[PDB]
Amino acid sequence: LIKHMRAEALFDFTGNSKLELNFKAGDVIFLLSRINKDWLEGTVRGATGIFPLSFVKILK
């Protein structure tokens, strides 16, 4: 699993199921894995799930 990497949400994201990670613009998401070209997996707000790469920017 990925360690020490984070992304910041650029927009709010409300998922379609509990497999998807909900967040608000500005939230910092702790990255865990990459699902495919368009989706990442991470944790924020106590939950773990998938979300779109296009909704975040990777932090330095």
């Binding site: 927009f11 379609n16 989706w39 779109p52 909704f55």
Partner: peptide
């Protein structure tokens, strides 16, 4: 700013 479109979800159907 408007939210971008959501990419197709992973699937096997």
């Amino acid at each position: 700013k408007p939210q971008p479109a959501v990419p197709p979800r992973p699937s096997a159907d």
